[PDB]
Specification:
2 copies of one chain form a homodimer. By secondary structure, chain A is of the alpha/beta class. Chain A has one domain: Glycosidases (TIM Barrel). Chain A is built from 15 helices and 14 strands. In chain A, strands 1-2-3-4-5-7-11-12 form an 8-stranded parallel beta barrel, surrounded by 6 helices. Chain A has a 4-stranded mixed beta sheet with strand order 6-8-10-9, covered by helices on one side. The A-B interface holds A 1, 227-234, 236-237, 240, 244, 248, 260-262, 264-266, 299, 301, 338-341, 351-354, 356-357, 360-361, 363-365, 367, 410-413 and B 227-234, 236-237, 240, 244, 248, 258, 260-262, 264-266, 269, 299, 301, 338-341, 351, 353-354, 356-357, 360-361, 363-365, 367, 410-413. The complex binds 6-O-phosphono-beta-D-galactopyranose (2 copies). Chains A, B: Keywords: Glycosidase, Hydrolase. Chains A, B: This is Putative 6-phospho-beta-galactobiosidase.
Chain lengths: 474, 474
């Protein structure tokens, strides 16, 4: 007795501006931190960058026609802040706004609901140069000016908005792991920037209530639900520590305005806790979102880890399977291979039931509606003769996730929509172009732009049918 | 470096009226449901009952002097509703109150803080005869009237109160498993009674805020933290179901005034959900407790359970190790042996790290102070020539738990106190006299009443030292 999907369930697909747009220095666009970082030697796969990406800035009309052919109910994209404020906080670049205005009109003219991500990792380099971007409280007012600019321009036409895409990733990768800009590896700096980002999220949610009173807004969290390895009490405890440090650290702030205490105490015991100003807690507690945005791709299995144990692990950026290694926080937990699930060529776990679990944990802890803002399978694809791509592996992945979503809905989770990552193939920040997620193949690779032609994959036709039957036929 | 136990930490021990008092028909006392139930053949181990028990009603001066010798900071006990209102709701029986007043006096005179439990499973049989007791909303006003009598009479000498002792257990055993009065096996009646107990709890918490404004009050929940057996997604999901169904079903209502949605929907799907009435929600939501009382003995490991798999299992009431079998809810989860822990002769898991896990979950989800209202080890004891009871097994159990408590406190959990189960040996409801938990041995068994003389066990002195050092020495 499964519930159906709701009559107006937002069947979607997603992109991010740096990964798709190209036109990195056209029509007055300023440099973003990713324009600079990606052109540093050694930072990205084979030196790939988003100078051209898949040229969505020029080809958006074609891409939207293909969305309309698919029957997409919603398209999630991000706004490139450096297109709108070339120097982050100066005068507005109207040509930048005009691009998003053309895109939104194009979507609406085809009956597609826009879902706008304010921030998908691309703070203008000028703010980084001026004051260190996310490490300065100055960014709170600067992010707010940019958000309000969009809210006033587009608020009439866009109802669904995402504030920060994966704060947990951009902050940890940028300031702990050194793998995203600004390339820092300093845990204290990381938790300071994170706190500032929390304040920026809250502040724009408050502004949103004034400028878009009939809208819906939330953050999109990169959620990997944690599992203990087995029922050994020390492994279950490792699991409580992981869930709290990796997940509650962010989601409790978004939902409740408070950091979890056992994590806080652990950080305070090392002088790593953020610097909290008077007024911070009041702001964080007075910015309730309409939904938790959830980016889900995999679960993580953890076990105990002694004080001299595993810290940073190797991440697979090449698509050679079995190249990842364990990571952790010495004393608290380490990741371990889950022997009950398959993995992708990039060593990501395939765990559709984990999505059902993550959705239940969120509903159960926070009582919040959930918009799944990303989910998808990143894999090698082959273009075959006759412009055919048979990505059965992708269909299988998506079908099983969408079935668990329906089970979560039947369990009583309020899921607003589902945005598959990604609509067209695009640039993977650290994995290049060969790690493909699209319904629509783009003809290019790491060595050549080729002709950038769009080619519908088998999954395109699978999803068109899912959407036509409102999820009744998977 | 661990945090120290705080300076005014309540180092306690506990009992319950039916299990300790005897004097079942003296001084005006009415029949309770347990007076009747225990006399029915087959309901108790070797037909044991509490007509005499360990005769605490006559020997309380001796017992309180033994508590003073130990150094106890607090003693948790229950009031026998049937001593105070022999009819449940008639005229108050002053001789009944007088005993509790004498007991409270003796406690205060020796410096010991009393913790009073309002309800420990012994509703007057008159109420059950009159209107089915917990199955009728009339018990809400009757219970409240009894609590208000006690608040008024003792509010100025008793600061800490527990409302219902293990609602989850007396409701479940009495209305689903048929092991406690009223001896019913009917899920529908179970949830209706449970819902009424919920409202009764909230009602008296509200009364308390008028009558004892400077006091602290909470329910005491029987908490077995759940573990998944392993990282199979289906087992983790079975763990989410078990924690929600066994634990959040109660704690969410105590803390937030709401039932969890997935358990609700699943019950609704079967017609098993409780009859809600206008005002119920407003009442449940307007009755925050000061703390969560936790009674803890063991964790439970679960795994996936087919729609046609395990339901009721064998429970060990004889102390013959290895006679318990798995229990489950078909389709949701079933219990399974945790290979990483030892068990007692009654097949209870020994899992002190489980306690820190549980305290951590409660603090993380509800942010409430915790009073550990029971914890202890039930085993066979041997009396030795010389009045020696070498209960090392018990010392080791309690040492480990107390150590995980200090770890939780350090992790940041606010534990107000710890009350070991039990001060003297006493009657176990279903297991008889041979299942002993006391620091003070009581000379009787399931065959012979002998003389009921109190002998200090090795653990008595152990705990004496613990209290002497405020935890510093174990
Ligand atoms: O590109 P990857 O590393 O395979 O990850 C896939 C996706 O990850 C999400 O975490 C990001 O929001 C996306 O921009 C995209 O990168
Ligand atoms: O007596 P047992 O079955 O060994 O249980 C030990 C304890 O269970 C607790 O939860 C009950 O509140 C106590 O009254 C005592 O019965």
């Amino acid at each position: 007795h499964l519930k159906p999907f709701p009559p107006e369930f937002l069947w979607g697909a997603a992109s991010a501006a740096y990964q798709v747009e190209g036109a990195w220095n056209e029509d007055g666009k300023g440099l973003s931190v990713w324009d600079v970082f990606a052109k540093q030697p050694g930072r990205t796969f084979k030196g790939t960058n988003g100078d051209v990406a898949v040229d969505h800035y020029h080809r958006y009309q074609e891409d939207v026609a293909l969305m309309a052919e698919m029957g997409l109910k919603a398209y999630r994209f991000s706004v490139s802040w450096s297109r709108v404020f070339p120097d982050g906080n100066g005068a507005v670049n109207e040509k930048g706004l005009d691009f998003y205005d053309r895109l939104i009109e194009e979507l609406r003219n085809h009956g597609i609901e826009p879902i706008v991500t304010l921030y998908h990792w691309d703070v203008p380099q000028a703010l980084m140069d001026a004051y260190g971007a996310w490490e300065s409280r100055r960014i709170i007012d600067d992010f707010d000016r940019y958000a309000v600019t969009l809210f006033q321009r587009f608020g009439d036409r866009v109802k669904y908005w995402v504030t920060l895409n994966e704060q947990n990733i951009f902050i940890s990768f940028g300031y702990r792991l050194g793998l995203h800009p600004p390339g820092v590896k300093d845990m204290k700096r990381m938790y300071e920037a994170n706190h500032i980002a929390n304040l920026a999220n809250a502040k724009v949610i408050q502004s949103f209530r004034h400028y878009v009173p009939d809208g819906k807004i939330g953050p999109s969290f990169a959620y990997s639900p944690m599992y203990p390895y087995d029922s050994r009490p020390e492994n279950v405890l490792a699991f409580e520590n992981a869930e709290e440090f990796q997940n509650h650290w962010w989601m409790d702030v978004y939902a409740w305005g408070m950091y979890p205490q056992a994590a806080w105490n652990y950080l305070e015991s090392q002088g790593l806790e953020p610097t909290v100003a008077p007024g911070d807690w009041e702001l964080l507690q007075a910015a309730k979102p309409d939904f938790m945005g959830v980016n889900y791709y995999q679960t993580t299995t953890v076990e105990h880890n002694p004080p001299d144990g595993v810290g940073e692990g190797v991440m697979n950026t090449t698509g050679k399977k079995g190249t990842s290694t364990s990571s952790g926080i010495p004393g608290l937990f380490k990741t371990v291979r889950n022997p009950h699930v398959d993995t992708t060529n990039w060593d990501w776990a395939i765990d559709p039931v984990g999505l059902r679990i993550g959705l239940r944990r969120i509903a159960n802890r926070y009582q919040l509606p959930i918009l799944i803002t990303e989910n998808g399978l990143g894999e090698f694809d082959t273009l075959e003769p006759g412009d055919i791509v048979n990505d059965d592996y992708r269909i299988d992945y998506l079908r099983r996730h969408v079935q668990e979503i329906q089970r979560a809905i039947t369990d009583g989770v309020d899921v607003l929509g589902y945005c598959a990552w990604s609509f067209t193939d695009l640039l993977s920040w650290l994995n290049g172009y060969q790690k493909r997620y699209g319904f629509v193949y783009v003809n290019r690779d790491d060595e050549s732009e080729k002709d950038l032609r769009r080619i519908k994959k088998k999954s395109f036709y699978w999803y068109q049918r899912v959407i036509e039957t409102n999820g009744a036929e998977l």
